[PDB]
Amino acid sequence: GPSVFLFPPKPKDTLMISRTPEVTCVVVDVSHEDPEVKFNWYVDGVEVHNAKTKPREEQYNSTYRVVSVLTVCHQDWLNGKEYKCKVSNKALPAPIEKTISKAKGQPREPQVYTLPPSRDELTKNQVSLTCLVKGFYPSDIAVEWESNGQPENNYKTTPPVLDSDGSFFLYSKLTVDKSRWQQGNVFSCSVMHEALHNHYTQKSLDKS
């Protein structure tokens, strides 16, 4: 009897239209006697066939792992469409059907404030721009950095920390060469959260 596990799509995939959100169904501990697994997916009870089945890979404990991923787009995931990952197996006496959907709850709008580097770091070789993003519920957020319309790649975002009032807050430190910072280049912080107006908020920050 193989086990059934389900993983929701990552918040970044579901909060950027440029990316495709992918919901991952993982089946492990598959016996070698019956390694054939048939996958069925539901969208509010309506059968769909857009899911693709990855090739099975052997595990260290002499089992098999087969993963079925269904192509979903953001509008259906956001409104709370019920997705059922039915796993058909002969070893299991009955197929395992489990329900997944977006975590329902009240949304709180993030309050994006971008902070210039400390003057003590202006003498360093690399300033560190900051983007505080506080007071947002839930933790399904994505934070990016931009400069002249292109994404910066030297930014690290802290994990969402639970605030005092039950909301969440995090940061985003972008390490920018002090030379680039001192020519007045504009560096923006992009926040993609469910509770925002258009699921986007871009707060720029320059030498001013």
């Binding site: 690399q126 400069s147 319309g149 292109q150 910066e152 790649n153 030297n154 390490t175 060469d177 680039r180």
Partner: protein, 264 residues
């Protein structure tokens, strides 16, 4: 996502005359198909199927054509047009950057006087006793609806058909990926200038030139889209970008400059 075969006209004029014949070639580079092409010809509420044992389909009737290769979806529509009119504006089916667009103001076996190419319903060029308009280098400015008009001998000034010249990029604008934008000093970091070449222009090789902040790397251009740096020090931490070019160096697109920092 888009395994669509492309139909290539020969001659490339989508609008031709009644007695003329054009050959439609279902060119498939990837997922090739030398034969067994199902042509979904459609004129007026028709779904005519004319399968041929070759990759060509010589036709002499108007309508909208497409081809279906083995294991491949239906092709993009080709709006063929065979005209009995006294004057037509023959235009290429697909226009890409760096092309030599030749909008022919060709009459029906008559020397039409006072030809004038109109772009967007206003005069663009005048062809005195001439027919072949010429755009030496197609770009986004060469977009719109072209239509040539010309006096006859004494019967009628005749306005030709309207052809929409839409210019498509031969390749997508390059983006400079890297193995890591923060390589520790002493590590090999590989630059990548990816360009999703259009299926219309896939046999043409691309030449990539990779750049530091302002100093070119390597020796000019190279067909390899990957520029491998064996070990980059703290000195060469600047705006890295790349230029993707076609084989005659006619149309060159500059990638956005992504900054590469060196960690030590």
């Amino acid at each position: 996502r888009t395994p669509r075969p492309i139909i290539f006209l020969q001659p490339p004029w989508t609008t031709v005359f009644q007695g003329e014949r054009v050959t439609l070639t279902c060119k498939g580079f990837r997922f090739y198909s030398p034969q067994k092409t199902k042509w979904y010809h459609r004129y007026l509420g028709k779904e005519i199927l004319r399968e041929t044992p070759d990759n060509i389909l010589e036709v002499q009737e108007s309508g909208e054509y497409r081809c279906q290769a083995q294991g491949s979806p239906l092709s993009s529509p080709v709006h063929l047009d065979f005209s009995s009119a006294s004057l037509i504006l023959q235009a290429p089916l697909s226009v890409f950057e760096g092309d030599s667009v030749v909008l022919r103001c060709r009459a029906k076996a008559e020397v039409t006087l006072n030809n004038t190419i109109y772009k967007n319903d206003n005069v663009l060029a005048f062809l005195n006793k001439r027919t072949d308009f010429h755009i030496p280098h197609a770009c986004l400015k060469d977009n719109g609806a072209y239509r040539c008009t010309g006096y006859k001998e004494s019967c009628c000034p005749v306005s030709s058909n309207t052809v929409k010249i839409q210019v498509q990029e031969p390749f997508t604008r390059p983006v400079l990926r890297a193995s890591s934008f923060q390589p520790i000093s002493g590590n090999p970091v590989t630059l990548t200038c990816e360009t999703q070449l259009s299926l219309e222009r896939s046999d043409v090789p691309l030449r990539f030139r990779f750049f530091r902040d302002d100093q070119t790397l390597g020796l000019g251009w190279s067909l390899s889209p990957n520029f491998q740096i064996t070990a980059m020090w703290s000195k060469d931490s600047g705006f890295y970008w790349c230029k993707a070019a076609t084989m005659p160096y006619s149309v060159i697109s500059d990638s956005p400059r992504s900054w590469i920092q060196v960690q030590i």
